[PDB]
Design an enzyme around this catalytic site. Sequence first.
Site, PDB file in Angstrom:
ATOM      1  N   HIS A   1       0.814  -1.218   0.000  1.00 38.20           N
ATOM      2  CA  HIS A   1       0.000   0.000   0.000  1.00 38.20           C
ATOM      3  C   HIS A   1       0.845   1.264   0.000  1.00 38.20           C
ATOM      4  O   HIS A   1       0.415   2.285  -0.545  1.00 38.20           O
ATOM      5  CB  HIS A   1      -0.920   0.018   1.237  1.00 38.20           C
ATOM      6  CG  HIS A   1      -1.734  -1.232   1.393  1.00 38.20           C
ATOM      7  ND1 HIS A   1      -2.702  -1.604   0.486  1.00 38.20           N
ATOM      8  CD2 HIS A   1      -1.722  -2.188   2.347  1.00 38.20           C
ATOM      9  CE1 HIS A   1      -3.254  -2.740   0.879  1.00 38.20           C
ATOM     10  NE2 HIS A   1      -2.673  -3.122   1.998  1.00 38.20           N
TER      11      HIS A   1
ATOM     12  N   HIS B   1       5.695   7.033   6.462  1.00 41.31           N
ATOM     13  CA  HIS B   1       5.401   6.628   5.095  1.00 41.31           C
ATOM     14  C   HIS B   1       4.845   7.831   4.357  1.00 41.31           C
ATOM     15  O   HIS B   1       4.649   8.898   4.939  1.00 41.31           O
ATOM     16  CB  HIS B   1       4.401   5.478   5.098  1.00 41.31           C
ATOM     17  CG  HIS B   1       3.080   5.854   5.684  1.00 41.31           C
ATOM     18  ND1 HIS B   1       2.806   5.744   7.036  1.00 41.31           N
ATOM     19  CD2 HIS B   1       1.996   6.437   5.117  1.00 41.31           C
ATOM     20  CE1 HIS B   1       1.582   6.197   7.263  1.00 41.31           C
ATOM     21  NE2 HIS B   1       1.076   6.642   6.117  1.00 41.31           N
TER      22      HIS B   1
ATOM     23  N   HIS C   1       2.033   9.094   0.947  1.00 38.91           N
ATOM     24  CA  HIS C   1       1.004   8.882  -0.060  1.00 38.91           C
ATOM     25  C   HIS C   1       1.336   9.813  -1.223  1.00 38.91           C
ATOM     26  O   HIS C   1       1.787  10.942  -0.991  1.00 38.91           O
ATOM     27  CB  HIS C   1      -0.405   9.174   0.461  1.00 38.91           C
ATOM     28  CG  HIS C   1      -0.721   8.448   1.736  1.00 38.91           C
ATOM     29  ND1 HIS C   1      -1.442   7.269   1.779  1.00 38.91           N
ATOM     30  CD2 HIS C   1      -0.346   8.702   3.021  1.00 38.91           C
ATOM     31  CE1 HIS C   1      -1.511   6.846   3.040  1.00 38.91           C
ATOM     32  NE2 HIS C   1      -0.859   7.699   3.814  1.00 38.91           N
TER      33      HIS C   1
ATOM     34  N   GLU D   1      -3.407  13.482   0.818  1.00 37.63           N
ATOM     35  CA  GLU D   1      -4.672  13.055   1.418  1.00 37.63           C
ATOM     36  C   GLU D   1      -5.417  14.260   1.961  1.00 37.63           C
ATOM     37  O   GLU D   1      -6.530  14.552   1.532  1.00 37.63           O
ATOM     38  CB  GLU D   1      -4.362  12.017   2.493  1.00 37.63           C
ATOM     39  CG  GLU D   1      -3.626  10.797   1.935  1.00 37.63           C
ATOM     40  CD  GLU D   1      -3.926   9.522   2.696  1.00 37.63           C
ATOM     41  OE1 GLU D   1      -3.599   9.446   3.881  1.00 37.63           O
ATOM     42  OE2 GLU D   1      -4.500   8.583   2.077  1.00 37.63           O
TER      43      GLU D   1
ATOM     44  N   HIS E   1       3.564  11.063   6.395  1.00 34.04           N
ATOM     45  CA  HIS E   1       2.922  10.755   7.672  1.00 34.04           C
ATOM     46  C   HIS E   1       3.943  10.146   8.615  1.00 34.04           C
ATOM     47  O   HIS E   1       4.419   9.029   8.379  1.00 34.04           O
ATOM     48  CB  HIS E   1       1.764   9.786   7.454  1.00 34.04           C
ATOM     49  CG  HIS E   1       0.606  10.408   6.760  1.00 34.04           C
ATOM     50  ND1 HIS E   1      -0.407   9.687   6.144  1.00 34.04           N
ATOM     51  CD2 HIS E   1       0.322  11.717   6.579  1.00 34.04           C
ATOM     52  CE1 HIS E   1      -1.279  10.538   5.630  1.00 34.04           C
ATOM     53  NE2 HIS E   1      -0.877  11.770   5.901  1.00 34.04           N
TER      54      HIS E   1
ATOM     55  N   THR F   1      -6.136   6.687   7.718  1.00 37.63           N
ATOM     56  CA  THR F   1      -6.662   6.958   6.375  1.00 37.63           C
ATOM     57  C   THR F   1      -6.691   5.726   5.481  1.00 37.63           C
ATOM     58  O   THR F   1      -7.067   5.849   4.314  1.00 37.63           O
ATOM     59  CB  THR F   1      -5.867   8.052   5.656  1.00 37.63           C
ATOM     60  OG1 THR F   1      -4.552   7.525   5.385  1.00 37.63           O
ATOM     61  CG2 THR F   1      -5.779   9.327   6.491  1.00 37.63           C
ATOM     62  N   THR F   2      -6.312   4.560   5.985  1.00 35.50           N
ATOM     63  CA  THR F   2      -6.487   3.299   5.284  1.00 35.50           C
ATOM     64  C   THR F   2      -7.254   2.375   6.211  1.00 35.50           C
ATOM     65  O   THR F   2      -7.247   2.564   7.433  1.00 35.50           O
ATOM     66  CB  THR F   2      -5.171   2.599   4.895  1.00 35.50           C
ATOM     67  OG1 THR F   2      -4.602   1.938   6.043  1.00 35.50           O
ATOM     68  CG2 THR F   2      -4.168   3.566   4.335  1.00 35.50           C
TER      69      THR F   2
HETATM   70  N1  LIG Z   1       1.769  -8.187  10.486  1.00 34.48           N
HETATM   71  C1  LIG Z   1       1.355  -7.127  10.378  1.00 34.48           C
HETATM   72  C2  LIG Z   1       0.793  -5.706  10.243  1.00 34.48           C
HETATM   73  C3  LIG Z   1       0.027  -5.277  11.515  1.00 34.48           C
HETATM   74  N2  LIG Z   1       0.259  -3.865  11.842  1.00 34.48           N
HETATM   75  C4  LIG Z   1       0.567  -3.593  13.261  1.00 34.48           C
HETATM   76  C5  LIG Z   1       1.627  -4.481  13.952  1.00 34.48           C
HETATM   77  C6  LIG Z   1       1.646  -4.250  15.476  1.00 34.48           C
HETATM   78  C7  LIG Z   1       2.651  -3.473  16.036  1.00 34.48           C
HETATM   79  C8  LIG Z   1       2.668  -3.252  17.399  1.00 34.48           C
HETATM   80  C9  LIG Z   1       1.684  -3.797  18.209  1.00 34.48           C
HETATM   81  C10 LIG Z   1       0.676  -4.580  17.654  1.00 34.48           C
HETATM   82  C11 LIG Z   1       0.653  -4.803  16.281  1.00 34.48           C
HETATM   83  C12 LIG Z   1      -0.983  -3.172  11.520  1.00 34.48           C
HETATM   84  C13 LIG Z   1      -0.866  -1.650  11.420  1.00 34.48           C
HETATM   85  O1  LIG Z   1       0.195  -1.117  11.434  1.00 34.48           O
HETATM   86  N3  LIG Z   1      -2.047  -0.857  11.328  1.00 34.48           N
HETATM   87  C14 LIG Z   1      -3.397  -1.416  11.300  1.00 34.48           C
HETATM   88  C15 LIG Z   1      -4.147  -1.201  12.618  1.00 34.48           C
HETATM   89  C16 LIG Z   1      -3.558  -2.087  13.721  1.00 34.48           C
HETATM   90  C17 LIG Z   1      -2.588  -1.589  14.546  1.00 34.48           C
HETATM   91  C18 LIG Z   1      -2.043  -2.388  15.536  1.00 34.48           C
HETATM   92  C19 LIG Z   1      -2.467  -3.696  15.684  1.00 34.48           C
HETATM   93  C20 LIG Z   1      -3.445  -4.208  14.851  1.00 34.48           C
HETATM   94  C21 LIG Z   1      -3.986  -3.401  13.852  1.00 34.48           C
HETATM   95  C22 LIG Z   1      -1.898   0.585  11.211  1.00 34.48           C
HETATM   96  C23 LIG Z   1      -1.619   0.918   9.742  1.00 34.48           C
HETATM   97  C24 LIG Z   1      -1.733   2.409   9.443  1.00 34.48           C
HETATM   98  C25 LIG Z   1      -2.715   2.828   8.572  1.00 34.48           C
HETATM   99  C26 LIG Z   1      -2.852   4.165   8.251  1.00 34.48           C
HETATM  100  C27 LIG Z   1      -1.982   5.088   8.801  1.00 34.48           C
HETATM  101  S1  LIG Z   1      -2.156   6.829   8.370  1.00 34.48           S
HETATM  102  N4  LIG Z   1      -2.181   6.898   6.715  1.00 34.48           N
HETATM  103  O2  LIG Z   1      -3.471   7.246   8.909  1.00 34.48           O
HETATM  104  O3  LIG Z   1      -0.966   7.492   8.916  1.00 34.48           O
HETATM  105  C28 LIG Z   1      -0.992   4.669   9.693  1.00 34.48           C
HETATM  106  C29 LIG Z   1      -0.853   3.321  10.005  1.00 34.48           C
HETATM  107 ZN   LIG Z   2      -0.646   7.680   5.807  1.00 33.11          ZN
END
Ligand SMILES: N#CCCN(CCc1ccccc1)CC(=O)N(CCc1ccccc1)CCc1ccc(S(N)(=O)=O)cc1
Ligand SMILES: [Zn+2]
Length: 257
Positions: free
Chosen positions: A61, A91, A93, A103, A116, A195-196
């Site tokens: 992404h 990261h 966009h 965004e 971001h 935002t995702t």
């Molecule tokens: N395997 C694999 C990928 C999994 N990720 C996290 C890994 C983690 C790290 C520390 C503690 C627990 C889990 C997943 C992960 O990062 N997001 C998904 C939500 C989430 C967060 C934590 C736990 C579950 C789901 C956030 C992604 C994200 C989206 C948009 C922006 S934005 N555009 O709004 O800035 C910034 C960051």
């Molecule tokens: Zn972002």
Amino acid sequence: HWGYGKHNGPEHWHKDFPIAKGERQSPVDIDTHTAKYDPSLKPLSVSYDQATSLRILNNGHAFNVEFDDSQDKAVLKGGPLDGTYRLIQFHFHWGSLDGQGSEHTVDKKKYAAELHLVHWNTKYGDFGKAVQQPDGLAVLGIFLKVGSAKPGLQKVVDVLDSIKTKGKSADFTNFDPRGLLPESLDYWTYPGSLTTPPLLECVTWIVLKEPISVSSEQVLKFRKLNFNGEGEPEELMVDNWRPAQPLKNRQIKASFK
Ligand SMILES: N#CCCN(CCc1ccccc1)CC(=O)N(CCc1ccccc1)CCc1ccc(S(N)(=O)=O)cc1
Ligand SMILES: [Zn+2]
């Protein structure tokens, strides 16, 4: 699964993630004449001197530069924030053309890209717990316009060839994110979301007024990345941005007059 194409893009996300139509979604348009100066807001404190970058990852992404967030090394404080927020990753966009990619928008203007810097509130112990809280994250957003090169971005640009496709990572130690900041820390702030997908409503957005300039060659290299994995048909990683969402019952506050 979700993405940025015709059949899986932002207009489809609400089917798997109904919070896509929620009350504090991001990004938004920043109407500069309607944002109100809030003299109560403190200056931002960006303390990145001890940052420890570790790795750069193409996640299908965008690409993330990841940091060691097991200690208070690179932290964001002040401004609208209560407490200490640790930098976990940054990261971008970006667009397929220089007139789109950001965004957030400013008086409906789209920038070529948006950086971001993602931080989480240490009172919640880990990032996964923080995303379940309305004040769990603080994302510092910085607009990119095309003009002169940003010297501090070049080390990122030059490693992208090694992470062309989804799932590829590379070592990326000793990178200093202070080289990505503009001169001024004047900002707008509002409560919003990731935002995702999963679009969780856990973010205090802090969007800097002053863009950074990057060169045409720098952004062209972003556009050579791929959404696909290796051994799959090439889909260029471009236009990985969500458009502006309704402001609803929110006020954008400005740190500056
Ligand atoms: N395997 C694999 C990928 C999994 N990720 C996290 C890994 C983690 C790290 C520390 C503690 C627990 C889990 C997943 C992960 O990062 N997001 C998904 C939500 C989430 C967060 C934590 C736990 C579950 C789901 C956030 C992604 C994200 C989206 C948009 C922006 S934005 N555009 O709004 O800035 C910034 C960051
Ligand atoms: Zn972002």
